[PDB]
């Protein structure tokens, strides 16, 4: 799945993960740590929407 940051337009793609911030490819959004934030704008998880 993909999830968009409603603040900046960054797309969290589960197939890509976010390795530079400790998230390996294939990590589901719901599995992201509670303290993970948008790598671009710093928004909390609450500000993402599933596409
Ligand atoms: Fe963002």
From Swiss-Prot:
Keyword Metal-binding: yes
Family matches, as CDD domains: rubredoxin
Binding-site residues, Fe cation: 5, 8, 38, 41
Transmembrane intervals: none
PROSITE patterns according to UniProt: RUBREDOXIN (PS00202), RUBREDOXIN_LIKE (PS50903)
GO molecular function: electron transfer activity; iron ion binding
GO BP of this protein: alkane catabolic process
Residue span(s) of domain Rubredoxin-like: 1-51
Entry keyword annotation includes Iron: yes
Keywords, alphabetical: Electron transport, Iron, Metal-binding, Transport
Function (record text): Rubredoxin is a small nonheme, iron protein lacking acid-labile sulfide. Its single Fe, chelated to 4 Cys, functions as an electron acceptor and may also stabilize the conformation of the molecule.
NCBIfam families attached to this UniProt entry: RubredRD
The protein, known as: Rubredoxin
Native source species: Pyrococcus furiosus (strain ATCC 43587 / DSM 3638 / JCM 8422 / Vc1)
């Amino acid at each position: 799945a993909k999830w968009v940051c409603k603040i900046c337009g960054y797309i969290y793609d589960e197939d890509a993960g976010d390795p530079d911030n400790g998230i390996s490819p294939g990590t589901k959004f719901e599995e992201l740590p509670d303290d993970w934030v948008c790598p671009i704008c710093g928004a909390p998880k609450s500000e993402f929407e599933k596409l």
